[PDB]
Amino acid sequence: SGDLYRACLYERVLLALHDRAPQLKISDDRLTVVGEKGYSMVRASHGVRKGAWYFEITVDEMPPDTAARLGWSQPLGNLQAPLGYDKFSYSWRSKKGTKFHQSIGKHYSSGYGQGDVLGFYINLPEDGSSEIIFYKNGVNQGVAYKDIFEGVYFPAISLYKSCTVSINFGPCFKYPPKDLTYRPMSDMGWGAVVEH
Amino acid sequence: SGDLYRACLYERVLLALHDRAPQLKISDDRLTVVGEKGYSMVRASHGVRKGAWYFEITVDEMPPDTAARLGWSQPLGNLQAPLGYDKFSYSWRSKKGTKFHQSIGKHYSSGYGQGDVLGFYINLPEDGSSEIIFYKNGVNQGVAYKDIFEGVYFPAISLYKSCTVSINFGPCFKYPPKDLTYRPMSDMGWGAVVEHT
DSSP states (O other): OOGGGOOEEEOOOOEEEEEEOTTSEEOTTSSEEEOOSSOEEEEESOOBSSEEEEEEEEEEEOOTTOEEEEEEEOTTSOTTSOTTSSTTEEEEETTTTOEEETTEEEOOSOOOOTTOEEEEEEEEOOOOOOEEEEEETTEEEEEEEESOOSSOBEEEEEEESSOEEEEEOSSSOSSOOSSOOOEEGGGGGEEEEOOO | OOGGGSEEEEOOOOEEEEEEOTTSEEOTTSSEEEOOSSOEEEEESOOBSSEEEEEEEEEEEOOTTOEEEEEEEOTTSOTTSOTTSSTTEEEEETTTTOEEETTEEEOOSOOOOTTOEEEEEEEEOOOOOOEEEEEETTEEEEEEEESOOSSOBEEEEEEESSOEEEEEOSSSOSSOOSSOOOEEGGGGGEEEEESOO
16 A cells, blocks of 8 residues: 555644743743742643643753643643642642642642653543653652543643743653553654545 | 744654565555565665665564674665675675675674664765674674765665564664764655644
8 A cells, every 4th residue: 555655744842833922931942941030930832632742851950949830731731830839730740740620729749849850641532541650760659639620631841930940842852651551742742644 | 932832744764665575575654574595685765876775674583593694775676695795795694794885895894683683874975985894782882884886775674584663764773873873764755834724
């Protein structure tokens, strides 16, 4: 078959063009972001509703008195609040490695900080128990949340004061999980196949 | 600017649809191939004419009486001969690590075999301008050929008897070279920016 040889449309997965707190400072390549004062948030350009997906964030710089809450958000997530502030998102906090959802912080892992490469895994099986799992430098930190609200989840970054992080949607990861199957978030960019 | 958010056309880089010795057994995903009796050869779907490019090949299985010659070929390279048989291709042989061109084998590296991940770099004019360099498990084996014939070069695999190899055009390599810059062969798949979108 020549089916595999056909051209198709591809679009980049990036931090969002307009779906972002306007105070966050985003790089020209749309993959690096710097915080500004109180917590505020940006979602990726693409989100997922079914299957298992993965992305990475590198904490480029995290000066004293700065922080991040990183994770996944539905579209209704509040852009002018920390990730995990409401029922629409789940986050992992740099400080103390606390997990947040609905403004409730619970024990999870130890903290993370500058230079760490964080991993973000989600599994939304279809008609299967949904799960959110975080990784730190390739090490599985455990299931943080199970049976989460059904919906579309976007990779999401919220930052407090002027720390800097970089997001990598794939397909090439620094610490690919050895214990789980998934697709890189970059696979969300594949579109219609062209006939020839 | 919304420019980076625009759609682009992309086609996969694979072992060729028809440009292949028919006795070679190629997998459904078009990235794994098994030899059959005498040496025979297959080229990739895309070739390069300028710039620096890279791909990898993993030797999945190589029983005692089998072998490979791997490298780059122009379109006129003989499909029913080992790679490096004529003036249209340049190859690296599993047995003894010999380099072949125009059926002349010269000393190059030590051999390679089952389990090894081989790297293939080429640099074509643009700007001893052109060069072919081979890698084993991330180690640069040295410059094999300089000032090669002008033309378009395709990644190319020739196999002798029933050994099995898999090709990785990129973008994610197991042993990305640290000493050279290049584009993955997978980048040959990129087409025009479009509206759709």
